[PDB]
């Protein structure tokens, strides 16, 4: 839950997709980072605040971004200046979500209890109540400052509250041009606390002394340029309007307001160790809309990194591409769709659907749709979750095709040793995952493109152990689909229906015949010395072993030769001539294998001898058993295995 920050974000995205009212994609971002910083502060250890401080700041930024995207878009045709409205959006997040010390404890009853008659600790208790009131007013606590000013006998501060309440009645209107020049002159008079000296300059739009700013934090530090522009833009337009008159004016005001970049050149220069933090400098880029300019700049200095930034920049583009179509750079979009799917490795199991909302071109083309062919191995949970998100047809025909064609180039080293052994454990451990993508795509129409993948690996077996026999067992783990591919094949029209349905049916008969010979050869070899002294059951079982084999040989010779001779698709004939030429000698030795173990019973001698001696004699009428010796090299092997019967049968 709390640990899976990415999962929470994904859920919010999913809800929006179901609905497809558009301003709800970013509003859910305020419920994630909040519960996280709350789960490390409600109960638990106190040292977790070293990580909760990162969550205590990532949530206030999502609040400031929600007011900027709705002002420049949701312009309803209801019943002027569009750039001055940004100052109001900056004041809402700069006033509501600010730090405020609570009310002071042990407030004195009467005044001057220790009594130039007051001690040094009396102006401090007066400045303590002065700072408690100088802070609440800066955060918009009129409702609280108005009661706070009346409560502490602090009547010296109430005279300006209504002056602000009179300035608030003039701001809602959108004379007082002379009242702005008196407080600035009051800020140049001596005799004021440091907290009250900064309060008079902040309301008008002036700069106070630097000794009061030293205490001021570099984050808060930004309200100085915000209040000056307001005091100057209203005096400019106010000046333009001139609704006070020249006489009402007293002193010249800096009515030349600067831009955002000239103000940011000074806030990150007063307290740069914290004003340029990676979670606070993102608010200037929302006014510039440059997405891949802050993350792709941390991949070059590899000689000398922050996961919270990659999750927000990538989540911004899915909204930036949606808020304004193509607002995110097209290069940045595909660079964000690729950096997200790659960084989402520890959490790639559930986000296999959230990457489709911004398909764009990385998904329509074989770009962002080929990475799923690298993790879908054994677990059946991720294979079924991708079935949602409204994706099928060609995407299913492009993920299954990219799953079997992308591993065919890696088996190129498996066709070089045509006369030696090799390391086939990886092929016997990675090709098993190469059959779950097609077995999961239970489509009777997309069966022709995958039914040939097993026959394409018969030549990688070569001598010694064969990989097709183990591959024949993977197909037995999911048969019956032959009935689904034969019924669905009569649904779509096809012209060459006299050769496409005959190759699939003949390959299934040879493979099932091959899987049967492998299991028949595993039961006679596992016999060894079975039945012990009671060979009566073996006298009939070995009789069945010797009959089922003498029949299997004549049957397997007729299945491979059933391909006739002259055919146009001779590429399928030159590949099956070796597999047929490789299943011949292994049968004659099994009857002779009853002359090493069943030789303790002089019964397989007169039988297994002539049974294998004529196996080459009748293998001379059907075109001399073709030339299985010409396709494998096993000629003298047959000459010696049978020649040995002249020192045992006599």
């Amino acid at each position: 839950y709390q640990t899976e920050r990415f999962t929470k974000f994904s859920d919010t995205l999913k809800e929006f997709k179901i609905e497809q009212d558009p301003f709800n994609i970013i509003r859910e971002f305020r419920s994630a980072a909040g519960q996280l910083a709350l789960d490390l502060a409600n109960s638990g250890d106190e040292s977790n605040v070293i990580s909760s401080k990162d969550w205590e700041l990532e949530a206030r930024f999502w609040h400031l971004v929600e007011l900027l995207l709705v002002f420049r878009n949701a312009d309803l045709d209801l019943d002027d200046n569009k750039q001055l409205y940004q100052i109001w959006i900056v004041m809402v997040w700069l006033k509501e979500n600010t730090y405020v010390m609570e009310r002071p404890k042990n407030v004195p009853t009467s005044k001057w209890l220790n009594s130039n008659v007051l001690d040094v600790k009396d102006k401090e208790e007066d400045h303590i109540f002065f700072k408690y009131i100088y802070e609440l007013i800066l955060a918009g606590a009129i409702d609280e400052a108005l009661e706070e000013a009346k409560l502490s006998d602090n009547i010296s501060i109430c005279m300006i509250l209504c002056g602000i309440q009179e300035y608030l009645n003039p701001v809602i209107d959108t004379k007082h041009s002379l009242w702005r020049r008196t407080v600035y002159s009051l800020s140049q008079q001596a005799g004021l606390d440091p907290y009250e000296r900064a309060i008079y300059s902040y309301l008008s739009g002036a700069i106070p002394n630097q000794e009061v700013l030293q205490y001021s934090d570099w984050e808060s530090d930004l309200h100085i340029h915000l209040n000056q522009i307001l005091q100057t833009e209203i005096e400019n337009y106010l000046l333009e309007n001139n609704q006070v008159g020249t006489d009402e004016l007293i002193l010249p005001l800096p009515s030349h307001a600067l831009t955002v970049q000239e103000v940011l050149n000074r806030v990150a220069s007063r307290h740069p160790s914290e004003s340029e933090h990676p979670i606070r400098v993102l608010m200037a880029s929302v006014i510039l809309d440059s997405l891949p300019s802050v993350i792709h700049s941390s991949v070059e200095m590899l000689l000398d990194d922050k996961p919270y930034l990659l999750r927000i920049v990538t989540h911004l583009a899915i909204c930036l591409d949606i808020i304004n179509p193509g607002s995110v750079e097209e290069v940045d979009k595909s660079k964000l769709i690729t950096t997200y799917i790659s960084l989402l490795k520890l959490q790639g199991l559930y986000e296999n659907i959230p990457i489709y909302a911004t398909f764009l071109n990385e998904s329509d083309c074989l770009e962002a749709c080929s990475f799923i062919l690298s993790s879908l191995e054994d677990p059946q949970v991720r294979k079924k979750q991708i079935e949602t998100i409204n994706f099928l047809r060609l995407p299913a025909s492009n993920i299954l095709r990219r799953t079997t064609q992308r591993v065919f180039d890696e088996t190129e080293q498996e066709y070089s040793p045509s006369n030696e052994i090799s390391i086939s454990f990886d092929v016997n451990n990675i090709d098993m995952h190469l059959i779950y993508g097609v077995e999961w795509l239970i489509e009777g129409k997309l069966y022709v493109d995958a039914v040939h993948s097993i026959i394409a690996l018969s030549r990688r077996f070569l001598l010694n152990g064969r990989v097709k026999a183990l591959e024949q067992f993977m197909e037995r783990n999911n048969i019956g689909e032959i009935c689904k591919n034969y019924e669905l094949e009569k649904i779509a029209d096809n012209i060459s229906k006299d050769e496409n349905e005959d190759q699939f049916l003949e390959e299934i008969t040879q493979y099932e015949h091959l899987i049967k010979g492998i299991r028949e050869y595993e039961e006679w070899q596992k016999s060894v010395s079975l039945l012990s002294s009671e060979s009566n059951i073996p006298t009939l079982i070995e009789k069945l072993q010797g009959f089922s084999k003498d029949t299997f040989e004549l049957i397997k010779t007729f299945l491979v030769d059933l391909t006739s001779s002259n055919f146009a698709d001779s590429a399928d004939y030159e590949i099956l001539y070796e597999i047929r030429a490789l299943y011949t000698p292994f049968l004659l030795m099994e009857l002779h294998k009853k002359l090493v173990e069943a030789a303790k019973l002089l019964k397989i001698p007169k039988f297994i001898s002539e049974a294998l001696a004529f196996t080459s004699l009748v293998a001379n009428e059907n075109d001399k058993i073709y030339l299985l010796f010409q396709s494998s090299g096993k000629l003298k092997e047959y000459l010696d295995l049978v020649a040995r019967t002249a020192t045992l049968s006599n």
Epitope: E102, A141, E144
Partner: nanobody
Amino acid sequence: QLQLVETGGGLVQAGGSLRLSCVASGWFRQAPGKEREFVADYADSVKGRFTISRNNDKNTVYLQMNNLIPEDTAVYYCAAGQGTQVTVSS
């Protein structure tokens, strides 16, 4: 330790009324599963049915909810609160 005492929530029927009083010992909503959204400025889903009022110069907020529907069943929090449940049965 400034506190925010909220009261007035409860379970009503579709079409009933409620009065949420918030006294700042010193209005947003969250549905079951969704994110905290602002209710009261008035949200587009409560404009014309909910009314907000405040005592001039004080830190108190009252929200009168008339014509309540099943889309307003959630936990309401105060901001300037622990939460007060307001459910409406269909």
